[PDB]
């Protein structure tokens, strides 16, 4: 009874900036948590980012510490992701992931199509 | 300099009684109130009882009202908390805090400024004995060649203080100490594991020595990879 | 169920008021028999201070116009011969003024309409001369009495409303009115003594108490409540001076409620504003009576106002005993300092007779003035007979049980030591009424006649037994058990009260008054014992020097000079005193010169404050021989001009 | 009868980041609240009293604000020595009641947990009972989840959990999870499994073995 969609895309170029967005339909985000994941050939199912309810602390993957900007809109129930200084090692599919557990223990069940990003 | 000291804690049996003392140095008592606060493992802080010795006003919390007793005398500059009919949740560390006298409260009690260090009291229906030390080796079906963790467990002992060490302290990389957990039978159990490096888990039959002063147990167990 | 409940409450209150009116009117007709009494005999029926109050109503109704009559009573020169007193603000004669102002156009319009509002016929007494006894509302005595009894019938309705308010159910009001009816003998005496000042004022005091309880209970405020409180405070103040002290004990109670956070800020502000306005209007209407200031009612108003307005500055106080002690110190100190800062300060020197009686009860203060009160058996301690009579109807046990129940609930639904200035504690009207009951009980025990305050408050407190907050079938089945056991021990008191009839007059005083009519000139000045003088003024319309309203200042020393003819003073000295005051006749009785319980006969009250004159022959020892021997030899300048059957003696001053 | 509610039960921020901790009282105590700091194994020390008056000796980087019945403790520049638990108390009523107790942690790079399975040793086949354990290490944040099942059998009431204090090297945690079964309950289905779900992973990590 939950679903989400990701917008944006396009053939990116190294050294540019990106503005990804994911929005859920049929369910809110004030009570739930949220995360971002990456899926790449050879090494998929890799953690990227997570934030729970309001900004009590947002956690990032080790190799992308600080390079990602996450902004939330509870009224629009949307997440925006800001990207700068993009290195050519970002060729993968970005997934906006929802966890149905209020304990924030990581019960991620919905995947969707995400947004594919190919760098050169 | 004014300061607080506490005594009278330890280990007792459920359904018993115990008296504990809070003495002060510097300022004379009966010019201020003193209070008792409990702290339990993983829990918060809870005010218990209060006394003003200027004219003998005592107050309690309803959770302990009717069993605990407060009696503060001025000549020795000390107070006594005496508790009877110990329950199963009274195990905690007690602090003797100081506040303003109740007759001069007037806009409320002053903040507890000069706390006491606190004494730990425990109730257990069981007796005390030594720990049983057991080995723990990684399975060969997972993480073979890379990461490997060896463990030494101490089970079914009493009381809490039991310290385990590896090969006379020479092993330090990723050493972990686990706090004991009180299970239903009233006996504690913990373990210590090390992320042993590669090369067949260091090709050593590791030794874990266990120290527990109340039983004077100094057993040394041997742990080897499977 | 809310329209039906309130309407039935209103209707039942009106009905119990009408029933009380009829009951008191029946007891009056059984007591004084005005139906077959002449107009001059009805006047003699009003003994001591009632004859003085009725005489001014008679003065106004006989004047050529109302303004001329009120001018006569404001510049009166007859009540105290020697100076010119304003009796309107001096005896509290506002009820007489209102009743006369209503009576004059009533009769005047009756003549135009040819209505026979007054019916009467010749009545014969036998040995005496024929007289005329007259009936109807058109008769002045009946108009006066009907006004009094219409006012006094609403006391039961106010008690019913207070019983409903304090318990929030109709069973409580029923319990209160039933306890008032079965103890009607101790609650009031308006049947025996209609023209008294308390008979006009106490209904307004209890109405004010009911309105105040309503204002406290529902947290009311605004202008429309100031008007309602003032409209019941001003009439009570204009009447009965003692009302002020009553309104003091109210304020002392209100403060005690306020200090426990049971009354909000706005409601207390409304209450104190109502008292300020009512005091100002009463002071103005009483022609600036300097007695109203330097009483306890004005400093109390100011002290309570100051404590109310400096209350928000103490919001952050948390230790309740300190807060209560602080406000109590401020209240007592301000009120006491303002009282003594105006009595022994600006030298206003109010009348201190309330405090003179009280000092004689505990200390040894004798003070002939106080001896005239303390032996009167109405300024004495409460009697054990009254207490046993109140316990007979089970009124005291019921109120006691309700009181202890309230104390229990109050102490176990409120944090005693720690207060929050933002939370009102609820049930303030019940505490206010309980504290008022304690004050009234103290007053009633100290001076009997203040039982008129204690008994209705005992009824109101017993009405707490039907408070639901502190099973329906068990509750309703046991409340009717209480109502039934009350009926079992209260019907006898009603029957006994209704089965008593008064004595049949006495012809001595009529003969004396006829002699005074015929054998003295119209401007003769009379002196004598206080009860006789009011009658000598009411009928016979002669100027007098001393009167029974001896309370104020300006008549106190006159009585001490007049009653010096019962002392051991020499004949020449008393004759000179009488001549200086300028009296022509002195009227007294031989039962005033009798010799068991010394210190209440005049022959013993004149040895405490005249010890130099003891051992010399008493004047009464000369009167009771000059009347017997029939010759006025030994009393050389005194002549016994009237003597008949050795009861009334009239001496004439040479 | 008087109690405090505290929403930021656990707050994690980096050194130098401003942190604000709130405190709400059900009643309307005026200004008789105070803030306290307690370190693990040590007694509490007083920081701010009367909701705005900073104590003496305590550093000047703790600020206390009061608005009505709400109170707030703020640190503009969080520092490594300012890592303990915080408490909020009132003193306007005879039952003196503290707060739940918030904790301040260190921001760090979250890493995937590492877990290992361990069957009972050779000394567990003669004592009448045996324990299968899971040792997990090197993860962040605090919130995780460990599960025990034997051929898809949900568990309730028998699991034992032991948690280590935050490490001094990489500021991470370690867990020991214990499933103890008697000898009569030991020779049942041979497939023993152990599942862990973390917020930092999408698929559960399962360590399973066969008896």
Residue numbers in the entry:
A (entry chain K): 1 to 120
B (entry chain H): 4 to 229
C (entry chain A): 23 to 492, 499 to 623, 626 to 684
D (entry chain L): 2 to 212
Question: What do the paper's sentences say?
Answer:
C-linked glycosylation is essential for the trafficking, folding and function of secretory and transmembrane proteins involved in cellular communication processes. The tryptophan C-mannosyltransferase (CMT) enzymes that install the modification attach a mannose to the first tryptophan of WxxW/C sequons in nascent polypeptide chains by an unknown mechanism. Here, we report cryogenic-electron microscopy structures of Caenorhabditis elegans CMT in four key states: apo, acceptor peptide-bound, donor-substrate analog-bound and as a trapped ternary complex with both peptide and a donor-substrate mimic bound. CeDPY19 contains 13 transmembrane helices, two long endoplasmic reticulum–luminal loops (EL1 and EL5), and a globular, endoplasmic reticulum–luminal, C-terminal domain.
Among the selected Fabs, we found CMT2-Fab (EC50 = 17 nM) to increase the thermostability of the enzyme without affecting the catalytic activity. The CMT2-Fab used for these cryo-EM analyses binds to the cytoplasmic loops IL4 and IL5 and is therefore positioned on the opposite side of the membrane, relative to the CeDPY19 active site, where it cannot interfere with catalysis. The C-terminal, endoplasmic reticulum–luminal domain of CeDPY19 contains a core formed by an α5β5-sandwich (b: β1-β5, α1-α4 and α8). As this domain forms a lid-like structure that covers the respective catalytic sites, and given its shape, we refer to it as ‘luminal dome’. One of them links Cys407 and Cys630, thereby tethering the luminal dome to EL5, the loop connecting transmembrane helices 9 and 10. The presence of this disulfide bond in CeDPY19, which is conserved in CMT enzymes, suggests that substrate binding and product release does not require association and dissociation of these domains.
